């Protein structure tokens, strides 16, 4: 059927911000008697009126049926707006959404969730694995348990994506791996590490993924120093897939900086705020554009103070990939539950004392943060604030 | 093993004016020797300069080798633009295509098969049938018979495809079936009946096929009516895939008309050019977006001269289906004689007379026909010149 861009409730074709085109969803939609309203209150907070100012709202179990390739990789998208939609208390809805068997979300309150960020709208980002079928039924169901909910959705966006994820190391355990290419992910955190925001027009394989820069994550007194490429320098990807990641994360970085006796005594420190009794996949890339050789940088990695590159085997990028400029990552598995971190995730850096490298500093060019579903469930509750 | 759409001839990744992502060929070249090449001239029909500017030249046999999934089935398409490639007289180019053990092409000439159809680029589109193999073998070997033959070939796809042939039902025969479950087809015309091209990228099931218009394929006198359904009609497949043709092709169709003793008068006849000694299956697309009652419409149909529905069992779509707005098909098997037949299909529609139906009219909304292989063969002759 190919890529879609949904704005639900709309009767005519939208564009927003960043020159996506959007259509009506209504061609797509199974079930009868929903209901589509216009929120009355356009926070100036949003970047576009599109898909965010226009909603469809279901009082019974709505489906999507859209036309896909079975055998592909889906990216799926949902849009929410909670606002004022004359007649409602957006506060009311709670609610379900599935995909193909998949369970995305459980009584979901966009509301609640939006007042924990400090964010007006929110994006819903999920990587589906193949199901072999040529339809994605995406189901809407109004929670069981409150005789006034409903089930509302601004947008949807369906969009084929390579086979982008293969094994992870796990993180504290000696050559440990695990599989996640049947797995069904969530896309907790996207970020340009060191670099400005990346907007989905800029993004690579046409996948219209937003990267953000990272400082708001920086859980550790000192910044670091962020590190740019000199001018027109070349991200050489040999056989990496283009749709990994765009050019520009692999141009800056964030490091800890040129005092390497201050490196020593610190790590560089991200927090993140996720779901109890998941595993995360972390996507660490990572792109060496100021050295050239083996054993110039070298630094230890943890996440949830459990080692994931570090004794023996620590990082080093030019180790890694045997040549300035060429990118990469590298993907860390981690159980999150009571014992591990709870509801954070929190990913350390410092140098290496192994192997006497020439610098003690670390760097990091990008980071994503995924969620692998536990027996086709990816739904976590909602936040607290 | 992922699908493939390699432009050959390039070494850096492309796209088309459909969106269409396109990559080089180059890895998945494994024996011969080749040259990239670059056309002189780019044809004004062109829709775009890929992949069809670029080319692979081959003077000797070279295979391609591209991973598949062995227990399915894989549409394969080969992307030829007839012109001057470093030097060469594109008038010698006679050569043979084979994917795995099934003959595509022999003693092909591009440059004769363009200038009989009057279009400046070819694109051949089959369906193979799994090969319990998991590498696709496509080998290209330039004619052994002329002595400055040499193949070339501007892109290639493969892509996986779902199980959309079963049986058809043999004309002017009944309780006769031909079988297409585990047939090597090739896509001869694909067409969205009384409506406009559908472009590759709307296409259903992921599979960028484009459905054309079929005004320049009626040979009758008629044209007959072309309907589209209302604003937000929905098209309800119900248990039918919809892999099997996308929405757009339902919610359009071509009709006789609203005179019925006209209708009555006349069949909505199309014409079809194809190779002989073959089996074709045509695929009849249908559905109703304006009637609502079985015995509205009841239509009979031939194809080349013979009964596909017609006396005691026409053609009708809510009889078929059950209700407005629900899609479906039917396949009819035709052999295609050396003599009888003569290097055409017809396809007529008129009205049935049989059991008093409210009106007098004919309909379809879309329609394919695919070559059934013979022996492993799916190659047919060059086109006459003019
Ligand atoms: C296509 O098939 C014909 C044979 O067709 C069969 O035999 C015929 C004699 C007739 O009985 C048909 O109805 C049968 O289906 C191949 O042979 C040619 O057939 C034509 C007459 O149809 C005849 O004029 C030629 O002399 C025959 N040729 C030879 C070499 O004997 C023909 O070669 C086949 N073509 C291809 C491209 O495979
Ligand atoms: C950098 O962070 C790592 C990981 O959190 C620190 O190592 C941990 O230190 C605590 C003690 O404070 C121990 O309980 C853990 O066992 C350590 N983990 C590992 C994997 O060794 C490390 O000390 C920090 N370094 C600095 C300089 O702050
Ligand atoms: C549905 O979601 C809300 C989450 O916000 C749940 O209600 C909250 O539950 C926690 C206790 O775990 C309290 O701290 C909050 O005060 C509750 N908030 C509100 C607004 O009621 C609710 O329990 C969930 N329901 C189900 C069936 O899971
Ligand atoms: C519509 O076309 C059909 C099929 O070509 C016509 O039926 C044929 O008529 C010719 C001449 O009368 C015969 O040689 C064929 O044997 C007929 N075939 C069949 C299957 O009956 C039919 O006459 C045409 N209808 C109209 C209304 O013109
Ligand atoms: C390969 O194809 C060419 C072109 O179709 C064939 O040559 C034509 O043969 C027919 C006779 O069947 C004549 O009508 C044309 O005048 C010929 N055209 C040219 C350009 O020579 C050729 O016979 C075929 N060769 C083989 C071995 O099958
Ligand atoms: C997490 O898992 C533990 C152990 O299975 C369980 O006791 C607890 O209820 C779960 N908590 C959440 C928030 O899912
Ligand atoms: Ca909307
Ligand atoms: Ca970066
Ligand atoms: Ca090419
Ligand atoms: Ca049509």
Redesign the pocket.
């Known amino acids: 059927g190919q890529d879609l861009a949904l704005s639900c409730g709309t009767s005519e074709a939208s564009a927003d911000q960043d020159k996506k085109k959007w259509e009506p969803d209504t061609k797509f939609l199974k079930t009868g008697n929903s209901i589509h309203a216009t929120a009355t209150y356009q926070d100036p907070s949003l970047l576009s009126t599109v898909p965010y100012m226009t909603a469809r709202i279901f009082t019974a179990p709505a489906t999507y049926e859209i036309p896909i390739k079975g055998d592909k990789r889906h990216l799926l998208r949902l849009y929410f707006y909670p606002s004022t939609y004359t007649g409602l208390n957006i506060?009311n809805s709670?609610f379900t959404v599935e995909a193909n068997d998949v369970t995305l979300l459980s009584?979901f309150?966009a509301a609640?969730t939006c007042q924990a960020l400090t964010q007006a709208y929110l994006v819903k980002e999920y990587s589906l694995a193949p199901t072999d079928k040529d339809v994605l039924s995406i189901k809407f169901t109004p929670?069981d348990?409150y005789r006034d909910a409903f089930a509302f959705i601004n947008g949807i966006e369906v969009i084929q994506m390579p086979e982008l994820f293969d094994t992870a190391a796990l993180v504290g355990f000696t050559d440990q791996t695990m599989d996640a290419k049947t797995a069904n992910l969530q896309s907790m955190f996207r970020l340009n590490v060191g670099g400005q925001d990346i907007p989905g027009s800029q993004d690579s394989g046409g996948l219209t993924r937003t990267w953000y820069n990272d400082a708001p994550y920086i859980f550790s007194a000192g910044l670091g120093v962020t590190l740019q490429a000199s001018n027109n320098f070349r991200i050489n990807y040999q056989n990496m897939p283009v749709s990994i990641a765009p050019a520009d994360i692999y141009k800056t970085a964030r490091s800890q900086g040129p005092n390497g006796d201050i490196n020593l005594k610190s790590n560089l420190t991200w927090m993140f705020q996720i779901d109890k009794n998941f595993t995360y996949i972390l996507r660490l890339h990572f792109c060496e554009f100021q050295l050239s050789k083996i054993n110039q940088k070298v630094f230890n990695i943890y996440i949830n103070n459990r080692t994931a590159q570090a004794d023996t085997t620590p990082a080093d990028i030019i180790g890694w990939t045997g040549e300035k400029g060429i990118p990469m990552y590298k993907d860390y598995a981690i159980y999150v539950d009571a014992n591990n971190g709870g509801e954070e995730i929190t990913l350390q850096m410092t140098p290496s004392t192994f192997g006497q490298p020439e610098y003690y500093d670390s760097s990091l060019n990008g980071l994503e943060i995924f969620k692998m579903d536990t027996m086709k469930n990816l739904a976590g509750?909602?936040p607290?604030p």
């Open positions: 506060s709670y009584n309150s609640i929670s348990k509750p909602n607290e």
